Design a protein around this ligand. Structure first.
Ligand SMILES: C/C=C/Cn1c(Cc2cc(OC)c(OC)c(OC)c2)nc2c(N)ncnc21
Length: 210
């Protein structure tokens, strides 16, 4: 049962800008996604101090980076707070509308795409390198969902029947053909060291088997 939704026009416009603008410094996507994971980990950690049972779905707070050359995917996994169905369809986008407007205006005033994170829409920097983004996510007291979009104005949400996560989020980047450098160990290591070296959770970079 797959549901298809239209992005708000402003968000579709942002995604088109990210896809169409000539901008070579694409590597900043990884910092943005790791930052998002860190924020989600911060949130479940904070909530767990007044309700310890929120960690019944898993106590370990960390981030995995998993490249797969066969699937041409880079996956960012965290055991953070996860996202609800309401998040995925309505609430994140409602928040994102104002950040998008502010970001657009900042760009026209001379800012560049690397500053996208300040506006709360850094998630969409994924489309610098991914033709399709699949997000598997599990929040306490909600089901496991798969969100997906190849841009073009729409996204899908379905209940996920894949491998159950206890809690957290997997952002699966289906990389563009010319962006496979982000599957290479030395490249990912370089980027993490450059932009994410003080993140307060373990970041495990998996090695490709093949
Ligand atoms: C400020 C938005 C936070 C939501 N969020 C994102 C980024 C994000 C995901 C989204 O959906 C997967 C978004 O809507 C499509 C979105 O809109 C700005 C942002 N990553 C994560 C994550 N790893 N864990 C828990 N929440 C997250």
């Amino acid at each position: 049962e797959v549901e298809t939704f239209a992005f708000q026009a402003e968000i579709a416009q942002l995604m088109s800008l990210i896809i169409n603008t000539f901008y070579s410094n694409k590597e900043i996507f990884l910092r943005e996604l790791i930052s998002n994971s860190s924020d989600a980990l911060d949130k479940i950690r904070y909530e767990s101090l007044t309700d310890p049972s929120k960690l019944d779905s898993g106590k370990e707070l960390h981030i995995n980076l998993i490249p797969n050359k066969q699937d041409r995917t880079l996956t960012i996994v965290d055991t953070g707070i996860g996202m609800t169905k309401a998040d995925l369809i309505n609430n994140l986008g409602t928040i994102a509308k104002s950040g998008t407007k502010a970001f657009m205006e900042a760009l026209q005033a001379g800012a560049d795409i690397s500053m996208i994170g300040q506006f709360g829409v850094g998630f969409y920097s994924a489309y610098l390198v991914a033709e399709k983004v699949t997000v598997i996510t599990k929040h306490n007291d909600d089901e496991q969902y798969a969100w997906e979009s190849s841009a073009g104005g729409s996204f899908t949400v379905r209940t996920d029947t894949g491998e159950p996560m206890g809690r957290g989020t997997k952002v699966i980047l289906h990389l563009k053909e010319d962006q496979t450098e982000y599957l290479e160990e030395r490249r990912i290591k370089e980027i993490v060291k450059k932009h994410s070296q003080f993140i307060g959770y373990p970041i495990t970079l998996f090695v490709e088997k093949e």
